[PDB]
Design a binder for this molecule. Structure first.
Ligand SMILES: [Zn+2]
Ligand SMILES: [Zn+2]
Ligand SMILES: [Zn+2]
Lengths: 138, 7
């Protein structure tokens, strides 16, 4: 019933990732996450609407790109990207230990910037700019 | 990666 157990089931192909909210683990998916393959529930849609483009004075987004929270986050080293990712989301959706590899990497291109585009279960949508246009549409 | 606290 936890987010961690649901993601475990996804890795075991006992469940499709589009059928879970990848930001909180809710089964009450109401849309596809606009940036990565996977679902999004109404709570997280709302958190994204309020939170996703909040910025700190360091020029970076205030919260995690995936969950729109986090207490401690990694910042993208791309001088053209202002995104952050929390350790919890990274080690869950990419895989355990992934966050510490990324923290060590210098400089680090985040999962939205990286050319590989797929990282464990974390798969960037090829059409994320279209999905963002639709998400913020009237 | 640089890190930061969100709080
Ligand atoms: Zn959710
Ligand atoms: Zn997160
Ligand atoms: Zn980036």
């Amino acid at each position: 019933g936890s987010r961690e157990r649901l993601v475990y089931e996804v890795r075991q192909k006992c469940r499709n990732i589009e059928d879970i909210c990848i930001s909180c683990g809710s089964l009450n998916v109401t849309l596809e996450h606009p940036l990565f393959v996977g679902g999004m529930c109404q709570n997280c849609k709302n958190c994204f609407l309020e939170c996703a483009y909040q910025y700190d004075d360091d020029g970076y987004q205030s919260y995690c790109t995936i969950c729109c929270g986090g207490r401690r986050v990694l910042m993208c080293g791309n001088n053209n990207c202002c995104r952050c990712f929390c350790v919890e989301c990274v080690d869950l959706l990419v895989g355990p230990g992934a966050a510490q590899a990324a923290i060590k990497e210098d400089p680090w291109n985040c999962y939205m910037c990286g050319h590989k585009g797929t990282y464990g279960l974390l798969r960037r949508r090829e059409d994320w700019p279209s999905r963002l246009q639709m998400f913020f549409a009237n | 990666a640089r890190t930061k606290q969100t709080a």
